[PDB]
Structure 1
Amino acid sequence: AVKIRLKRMGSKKSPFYRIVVADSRSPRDGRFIETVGTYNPLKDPAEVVLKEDLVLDWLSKGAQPSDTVRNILSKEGVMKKHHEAKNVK
């Protein structure tokens, strides 16, 4: 059940999120595989940097992103290019 999701690094009141693929058995900030991109919640509009090249060949291997990951990957056409590459091809 490989799965990409969030992981936070903030202090007490102001979080800061990194997107990182972890196995689902692991804890919230436990071990993982590799960090791919991060997520700043604060300072709206939301500020996201992604490597976005491992992600295509790392979803084609098959992993299920969570819901906040789904919104912030829909905001860059990630799933767009995913089904444009898989179904459409």
Structure 2
Amino acid sequence: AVKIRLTRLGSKRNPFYRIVVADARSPRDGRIIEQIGTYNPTSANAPEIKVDEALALKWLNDGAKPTDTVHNILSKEGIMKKFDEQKKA
């Protein structure tokens, strides 16, 4: 379906993911629906989680699914933890 993924950047052996929620029928670096935020877990300490969680309230409620690695940083950073009450509507 339409789903959040990990679309990367950066030079050799160094990724810079900006997340994208888009269809699974596209390639991993293909044309998108929405580039929400970035996620650079590859640092010395931080995962550098920048998130604009306002639009997960839309797409996860009418068709978008978190998928098995983009699902559990939301359970880690707390993006879906705010959605936990927002899914409790």
Q: TM-score under structure 2 normalisation?
A: 0.86
SS in 2 for 1:21: strand
User: Which blocks of at least 5 consecutive residues in structure 1 are unaligned?
Assistant: none
Aligned to 2:30: 30
SS in 2 for 1:49: coil
The 5 Å alignment of 1:41-80 reads 41-43=41-43, 44-80=45-81
**Alpha-carbon deviation of 1:84?**
1.9
**Alpha-carbon deviation of 1:71?**
1.8
Q: Tell me the distance in 2 between the aligned counterparts of 1:82 and 1:63.
A: 13
Does the Cα contact within 8 Å between 1:15 and 1:41 map onto a contact in 2? Answer: no
1:21-56 residue CA offsets vs partner (Å, 9 max, x unmatched): 111111110111110001012222211101110111
1:32-89 residue CA offsets vs partner (Å, 9 max, x unmatched): 1110001012222211101110111221112111222112111232222323223x32
Q: In structure 2, give the amino acid aligned to 1:59.
A: L
Q: In structure 1, give the amino acid aligned to 2:69.
A: T
RMSD value, Cα: 1.4
Higher strand share: 1
Identity across matched positions, percent: 65
Q: Tell me the distance in 1 between the aligned counterparts of 2:79 and 2:41.
A: 19
